[PDB]
Structures are given as C-alpha cells and as structure tokens.
Structure 1
C-alpha cells in the first residue's frame, strides 16, 4: 500500500517552564509583637538558616530555567517587511503593531484563558524576564526560521527563500522535491487552513499551566490557617497567653506554639523542594524541544509531534511555553502487487531505495512515500549477481536508454 495523498496537521504541546517565587519569613511568621518569643527563637535559629537557604535556592533556580529555554540565540532578529512567501500566510505568529505589547495575536489569545499574603511575611519575588522581554526572544526565533531555517542558532546567518527551504525538509523523511513544485497551491491552502482550526479551538487543553498556579496558591492558603490552630494549647495568640497567665508560668505554652509552627514550616519547605524537581525536569525537557524541534529538523519518531515533523513555531505563555509543530501524516492508500527483484537475461536488478509496484498490465518503480509511476530503466536498477541465488524473483524485461542513443 502506497499513499497517494497527504495533508497538513498542527498539534499542540504544553510544557511548563517556571512558576511563582515565594519567600517565607522564618522570623516573622513564628513570633509577632512579643519580647519573650525572640529569646526562645535563638535556640532554634539553626533551623531557620537551613530553611532560608532552601527557599532562596528555589528562587535562583527558576531564573536559570528561563535562561536555558528562552535564550538560545544571542542576536535579536526582526521580521522582514516583505509579506511575500509563496502563497503561505504569516500574520498570526508575528507581533501586531496595533497592540500595546510586543506580542502576537496567538500569545494574546492564550493569555486571556490563563486567569493580602504579605501581612504575615509572605512576599512574592519578582521574576527576571518580564512579559516584554520573553516576547523578544520568541519573535527572533520565528523570524529566523522563515529567513534561515536552521542556519542561525549555531553559526553565521544564511539567507534562503521560503520556496527552496520547504523542499529541503521533505528530503529528510523520504518525499521527493517534485511534489512541492507540482503541488504548491495545495500545500499553501492546507497550511493556512490548519492555523484557523487551531486559532478557533484555543479561543473556546490549557489546564497544565493553570494547575501549577493552583498548586502554588494552595500551599500559601494552608499556612494562613495554621495561625488559628492552638497546636494542643488553649490560645493561638502570643498576647493572649501572657495576659491570662503570668510570664513565669507561660514558657511552657509559648514553646509549644513555636514548635508547632516549625513542623508546619518544615513540611512546607520540604514539599517545595520536591515540587522544584518536577519543574526542573520539565524545564530541561522543554529546552530539548527548543533546541531540536525548533532549531533544525529532528528525525526522532514521536518526539516533535505525532507524525513526521517539518517545522516548529514556539509561542510565549505565562510560566510555560506552547509549541505548534507541523506534522506530516499521509492519507488513503491503494493496493498493488510488489515484487522482490526483477530478472532479465540472467541479471538480478536491484533498486536504489524504492519498491516495484504493478499497474496490472505493466511494471513500474516508485518510493514508499508517494506513488510515482516511472519507467523501470537502468538508472534506477543495478546488477549485483545472478538470478539463481535469489529465492523468489519474477522475470521481466528492463528498458535501456543507451540502446536508442547508439542507433
């Protein structure tokens, strides 16, 4: 069965990059407006030193994730002013000048879908790359593939038209170059129609990036409820214990309130260090799709989308990255009659890299990618022994273009 028709499909992969950075004050969340609470904290000051270096280690780790994913090139590339590409359309992935931000229409659509703590010492650290600096690196990668393909992130910039660039991508999967020229209008309409289906689908999934924010805000609201629990005492207020009880008979209750909060903070930091490993593993995995699928054409099966990958289009996303791969999946099939080899006057003719198919009254030769009925000549078949050693071989004449030239 040889496919005789192909189509263009665009998939969607959601890979997280970083998350929100928090900072829990180890000296403010425990005590408050008391004097004797700071004296007992000095005995457990070694515990805050371990928790402070662990929380700061997660903050400095998220900044390194953005420098390894959204920082592959060192030169800022801009989009060409000429909107000529050969029937194809490119306007959704390019930043719109009418918008107040430097993002494209696709990045603004994904931002609409993605939809009080400092009073006790829970501040939020600001990220490094803002919403305007991430869009600059994404715009340079989209403008570099349309002008260089893959000769821009690992060497000098090399200009190349888009008409001849697409023909260099089918050679890695097996499709010949004559299919692009003879069917240029067909691919131009299927590529533009595939963008409209993804645009209308994302405007009406995206639950991977939203789940990360819900898990971070869930642990923040848990520590707020810990200030109301007595932890096996009678009150959770430092000013209430010293009021109803004398300071000589109050050290046995304040120590339980400080110890009860150390177990809650130790559990919080422990869970943040475990969740940081999943974010770090996802950041290193997203960097692989950026330097292989986007930068170049990877020949790995089921890696840059479901099907034969040709080109990628990375898009910006809040605390993540959205990829738009271009898969190549054939359609339909036709049954024929294959044959291992063809014998003529005792010579076993072997094909170069295809397979013989039969119309029914005649024999032909084509590839396993597209059905191309060609005349079996000597330029595609070569001898490599006799026909007696090959088990199971048919008999058919072989055309020789050299014979009519000599006459």
Structure 2
C-alpha cells in the first residue's frame, strides 16, 4: 500500500498555536513527504516491471482446441464482469470505520495507477502469446506453431526425444488436465496458501495502527491534549510542555518512515525476483535447477493476485 501523511495535522491538529511553533522546528515535515513519495512512486514501478513485459495485446482464437489441453481454468471468463479466470477470481476472495478514524488523524492511502482489470488484462496477453506462439514472441515477432508441436520442442530441451510425446499425446494431455483441476481444490480447500500476500497487508495495517496509539502518550508532559495545555498555562510555561509533545510525536513519525523504507526495500527485492521469473520461466524455458518448479521445467503460466503474482509451473517428473 502507498501511504500519504499530513505532517501538520498528525502532530498539531486544530491547534493554530502549535502550527506556528512547528515552523521553527526545521524542515522535518518536508523530508517526511519526500521519503514517503519515493516509496509510493516505486510501487507503481514494481508492478510495471513484472507485468508490462510485452508491447502488444494478443488474443486467443475462438476455437479452443489445442490437442487435448483444456486451459479452461486459466483463460479469462467472459461471464464474469471483471473478466478473470476461474482460478484468478478464487484468489481475489482469499486475500482481504477504522479507515475513517485514521483519515481524521491525517493518514491517507493513495490508489494504484494500474487498476485490477488492467493488470488482469496484461496476464491474458501473456497467456495468449505463450500458447499460440510458444517462446518466439518474447524475442521478436510472434510466430504461430501448433501446441502439440510446441510441446515436442520442449521435450527436446530436457533431453527426451520428440517421438515420446507424439506416442503419448493422449495420456500426457490427460495428466495435464487432471493436475490443473487439483490446483483449484488445493487453494480453495486450504485457506493458508496465501500467507505471504496476507503478511504484507497485515504488517502495513498494524504498523499504521501503532502510529495512532502513539497520540495518547504524555511523553512526560502534564497532558496529551494540546488545547488543554494552552488553555491552562501561561505562554512562557507552555513552551516547555509543547516541546516534549512535539518532539515525542516527531520521533514517532520518523520511526514509522524508517520502518517503511526498510520494508519497501525488501519488497523491491521480491518484486525484482518475480520479474526475472516471468522473463525466464514464462517467456522461455529454463535450465536452472529448481528455479521454475521442482523437476524438469516445461512451461509456466502466470496468474494475477492482489498485490502479487502466482506462477503455475509445469514440470516433467520421472517415475517407475
């Protein structure tokens, strides 16, 4: 989440006298604005790098016959108004007056540049490209190739001859269809799958709530209400009392920003890794061990998630 903080309102509020004293407390408010703005801008860059890997918007031809491979669970659904795949909209439900109270203290949340539909529209392009053109569309013009012939190409990458696929085309298609169906039940049955995406939401909200509770701290002063202090002490007395409150509250804001800068850097590391996975595991075939799934990598399909991305790795596993 991208956050915007009103420096004056959080510290002072409706106290006009506090606003004047804050002027001589240096340029701390400006520094806080710049630091939080850099984090908010960075968030739009992270989404752009992962998803906008293609310049064109491909579409899947109406006749959905691909030599036995369904792709129904991962392709977009016209019936849904959001136009999301049956797996994608299952993810949007697993991941989820309090907002009003935080707003009145000067804490606001800014909306992302890319809407959910726009992001889901990008993943649909990568699905149509990866099916109708294999890996060619990631390095120039997109060239069509039959999907069963494309699988035979990927079998040669892992060291298995072409004739193995062609003699087992029916069986391999059945195995892929069965594996896909079990994916939806695994997520739908087990609500703990999206633990990583939830922690990002939880830690942001919980860190913000800590900031609000800090507004009820005396910090050694007689009271934690600015109006009472001004309306109970003479001017040269109140100064030694407001200063403790202002510095106590300035420390809280500085602490919050420092934790956010640290967390943003960790997120960017995770965002950079996901962009690498999409270029190597989705736009091509990877020989790196365990990078894209466990086994011998065949292909991958991406799915958009709230504040994240989900990769479905298709792999070859020996047996018997």
Task: Report the TM-score when normalising by structure 1.
Answer: 0.76
Distance 2:292 2:241 in 1: 60
Q: Does structure 1 retain, via aligned residues, the 8 Å contact 2:9–2:106?
A: yes
Q: Which runs of 5+ in 2 are unaligned?
A: none
Q: Does structure 1 retain, via aligned residues, the 8 Å contact 2:138–2:284?
A: no
Q: CA deviation at 1:246?
A: 2.1
- Measured against aligned partners, the alpha-carbon deviations of 1:12-71 in whole angstroms (never above 9, x if no partner) come to xxxxxxxx1001111111112222212221122311122111000000000111111000
Distance 1:301 1:32 in 2: 57
> Higher Cα Rg: structure 1 or 2?
1
- Measured against aligned partners, the alpha-carbon deviations of 1:321-363 in whole angstroms (never above 9, x if no partner) come to 000000111012xxxxxxxxxxxxxxxxxxxxxxxxxxxxxxx
Q: CA RMSD in A?
A: 0.9
Q: CA deviation at 1:151?
A: 1.0
Deviates more, 1:26-35 or 1:321-330: 26-35
- Measured against aligned partners, the alpha-carbon deviations of 1:89-141 in whole angstroms (never above 9, x if no partner) come to 12111111111112111100011111232111101011011111001110000
- Measured against aligned partners, the alpha-carbon deviations of 1:277-333 in whole angstroms (never above 9, x if no partner) come to 10110111000001000001011111011111101000000000000000111012x
Q: Of Structure 1 and Structure 2, which has the larger fraction of its residues in strand? A: 1
Q: Does structure 1 retain, via aligned residues, the 8 Å contact 2:123–2:303?
A: yes
2:123 — aligned with what? 138
Where do 4+ consecutive residues of structure 1 move more than 6 Å? none
Distance 2:142 2:166 in 1: 26
The DSSP-based 3-state class of the residue aligned with 2:243 is helix
The DSSP-based 3-state class of the residue aligned with 2:108 is strand
Distance 1:111 1:34 in 2: 43
2:243 — aligned with what? 255
Distance 1:32 1:162 in 2: 64
Distance 1:307 1:232 in 2: 62
Select 2:41's aligned residue among 55, 60, 65: 60
Q: CA deviation at 1:73?
A: 0.3
Task: Report the TM-score when normalising by structure 2.
Answer: 0.96
Matches within 5 A, 1:4-403: 20-115=1-96, 116-204=101-189, 205-332=193-320
Q: Which runs of 5+ in 1 are unaligned?
A: 1-19, 333-407
